[PDB]
Amino acid sequence: GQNYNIAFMVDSSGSIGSSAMNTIKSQLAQVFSSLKASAGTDGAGTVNIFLVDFDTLANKSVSVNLKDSNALSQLQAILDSMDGSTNSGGGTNYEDVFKTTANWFNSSTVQGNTNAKNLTYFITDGQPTFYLENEGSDPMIRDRSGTVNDVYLSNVIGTSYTYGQTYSVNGRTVVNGNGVVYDYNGNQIGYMRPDGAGRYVYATLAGTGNSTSSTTIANSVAGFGLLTGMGVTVEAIGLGANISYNDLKSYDSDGVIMTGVNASDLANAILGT
Ligand SMILES: [Ca+2]
Ligand SMILES: [Ca+2]
Ligand SMILES: [Ca+2]
Ligand SMILES: [Ca+2]
Ligand SMILES: [Ca+2]
Ligand SMILES: [Ca+2]
């Protein structure tokens, strides 16, 4: 009768490669099928599953209740959207996926599943290479002579930003439905991203996308604290040869961490641990 809210944060950055990505997709579908069976047994509690693909940013995500007959299909659509190829897989943004997932743990789905165990599996093959900065800041959208005619993002979105609403200045799109923010000249400047507290807030992409700095790590750890701060136990699983115990030490609740995991062992690593 134990209720569960279980998230899966899945790295599809370009370091993964399509071979590992395809195995990961197959293994996760097996995990979800096993969990579906467990959730269908007599006396089973409510099991919500959240699945998010991430690279340069978190991409598509879905939340399902495993009692529903389209639950595995909705998870499958997210798996199918994952591109981990070397050339189009993307960068590695821990901070954004942590905040996206923290937002789910603030959601009505999670809060409504009372007395639940909140669990997250973080599945990655490498250190972060992007992060977010300037969160909640107020960028210039249109700079004119003087100040009185300047347009800031705050003049566009006000105090009531709605994620998915399109915002414009003189018919020019400034915030699109996916939350991409542009200046008046059409240059992309930032994104309206999950803040880890249930909201969507301006941020800019930072980092090189192909290397890791102390700042990248510090921002990743800060984002992680928003996720654990919701009362979530995180299990970090390091795939392959390029992620060490120490690279996952900050992102795992109990310090018991599997690294060097082969993609073909992923389902067992999750289900049998
Ligand atoms: Ca990577
Ligand atoms: Ca790799
Ligand atoms: Ca990707
Ligand atoms: Ca940050
Ligand atoms: Ca000005
Ligand atoms: Ca652990």
Author numbering: 4498 to 4770
The publication says:
In both of these bacteria, the adhesins are single polypeptide chains of the repeats-in-toxin (RTX) family that are exported through the Type I secretion system but anchored to the bacterial surface by a retention domain that folds internally and is then too large to pass through the channel of the T1SS. The crystal structures of the two novel domains were solved to 1.4 and 1.95 Å resolution, respectively, and demonstrate excellent agreement with their modeled structures.
But, after just two turns of this beta-roll domain, the polypeptide chain diverges to fold into a vWFA domain. This 28.3-kDa domain was produced as a His-tagged recombinant protein and purified for crystallography. Subsequently, the structure resolution was improved to 1.4 Å with a data set collected at the APS synchrotron. The rainbow-colored ribbon presentation shows how the N and C termini (blue and red, respectively) lie adjacent to each other, which is a typical feature of ligand-binding domains because they bud out of their companion split domains. The vWFA domain has a classic Rossman fold of which the first half (in red and orange) is laid down before a 9-kDa insertion sequence (yellow and light green) emerges around the mid-point between residues 4628 and 4704 in the full-length adhesin. This insertion sequence folds into a short alpha-helix and an antiparallel beta-sheet with at least one Ca2+ ion present that coordinates OD1 and OD2 of Asp4647 and carbonyl of Arg4641. The polypeptide chain returns to complete the C-terminal portion (residues 4709–4773) of the Rossman fold colored green and blue. It is not known if the insert, colored peach in the space-filling presentation, modifies the binding specificity of the vWFA domain (colored gold) or if it is a ligand-binding domain on its own. Indeed, the apparent molecular weight of the vWFA domain during size-exclusion chromatography is consistent with it being a monomer in solution. There was no binding of the vWFA domain to the endothelial cells, to human erythrocytes, or to the two yeasts tested, but unlike the CBM3 and RTX domains, it did bind directly to the diatom E. spinifer, both in the absence and presence of biofilm-producing V. cholerae. When the crystal structures of the two putative ligand-binding domains (red and gold ribbon) are overlaid on their AlphaFold3 models (green ribbon) to compare their folds, the agreement between individual domains is extremely close, with RMSD values of below 0.5 Å.
